[PDB]
Amino acid sequence: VIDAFRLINANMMVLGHEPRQTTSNLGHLNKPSIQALIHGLNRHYYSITINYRKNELEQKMLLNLHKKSWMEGLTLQDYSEHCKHNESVVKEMLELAKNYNKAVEEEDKMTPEQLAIKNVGKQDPKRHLEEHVDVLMTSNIVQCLAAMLDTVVFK
Amino acid sequence: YLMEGSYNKVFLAKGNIPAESYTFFIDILLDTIRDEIAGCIEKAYEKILFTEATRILFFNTPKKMTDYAKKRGWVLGPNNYYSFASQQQKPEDTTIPSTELAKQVIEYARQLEMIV
């Protein structure tokens, strides 16, 4: 959000002749913001299109630098705490799964829009159960995989 | 009888043939029996004197076992035959399992993210 601007002469408006003498369909690509139009947009000043210059040396030294780590790949993340995390998450599926049963019978009723609005105050096991499953599978797949990868890299 | 270990019956049937002597085939079975019997006894058992294995099948005191022992193992000692089987040094390793396991889990990752 920049939208660089410039002033228009008061003589032109007094003369009434439109400024900027458009000679290409390049400036009329961005719809002026209504908030900006309320003020002196196209009345006391005119916007100028703004673009950016990017090069690989700049990009590769920013994109391939921002979120990176050196050696965290081969770290087993507190093996004692890992299974404890699993127990807490899995135990949540025991109660979450039970509520799933109670959330299947009462569904598939008339006016599903009524059913759709009926899920605006209470947790929906359909989505909550999936969220836990997603984290569970990735955490162990990564955690387990590092176990065999390390067992060959180091002796 | 051959499918199970019951072999004392095989020699009993070897002397009872319906068609004829059929010896042109019984000779073939000898190769398929003695080789199997020796293999079974090859396990981690203890010493067996040259008195059971000698008078067991059909023969009293031949020299066949002497040749039999020669082509098999059964180191000769003070009337002492050994059959040692450890199969313990090879097991108890995961480095080789490490490569197999790594491929396995990656497939779980492969078939869990990319669209088929």
Concatenated DSSP letters of A78-119:
-HHHHHHHHHHHHHHHHHHHHHHHHHHHS-S-S-HHHHHHTT
Record the tokens describing residue B5, joined without a space. Answer: 């270990």
Which residues does chain B have within 8 Å of residue A151's beta carbon, measured at their own beta carbons? Answer: 94-95, 98
* Touching A: B residues 66-95, CB under 8 Å: 94-95
Instruction: Please indicate whether, in this complex, the C-beta atoms of A141 and B105 are within 8 angstroms of each other.
Output: yes
Using left for φ > 0, alpha for ψ between -120 and 50, and beta otherwise, residue A55 falls in beta
Record the tokens describing residue A140, joined without a space. Answer: 């162990």
Backbone angles phi and psi of A47, in degrees to 5? -75, 155
Per DSSP bridges, beta strands A45-47 and A5-7 are antiparallel
Experimental method: cryo-EM
Which residues does chain B have within 8 Å of residue A135's beta carbon, measured at their own beta carbons? Answer: none
Secondary structure percentages of chain B, helix, strand, coil, to 5:
45, 0, 55
Q: Are B48 and B41 in contact (CB under 8 A)?
A: yes
Strand-pairing partners, residue A47, are: A5
Q: Burial letters for B24-47: b for 16+ Cβ neighbours within 10 Å, e otherwise?
A: eebeeeeeebeeeebeeeeeeeee
Q: Are B50 and B75 in contact (CB under 8 A)?
A: no
d(CA A98, CA A125): 9
Record the tokens describing residue B55, joined without a space. Answer: 């008078």
d(CA A46, CA A56): 33
The chain A residues in contact with chain B (CB within 8 A) are 137, 141, 144-145, 148-149, 151-152
Record the tokens describing residue B99, joined without a space. Answer: 């490569």
CA distances from A91 to A88, A102, A129 (A): 5, 18, 12
Q: Are A6 and A48 in contact (CB under 8 A)?
A: yes
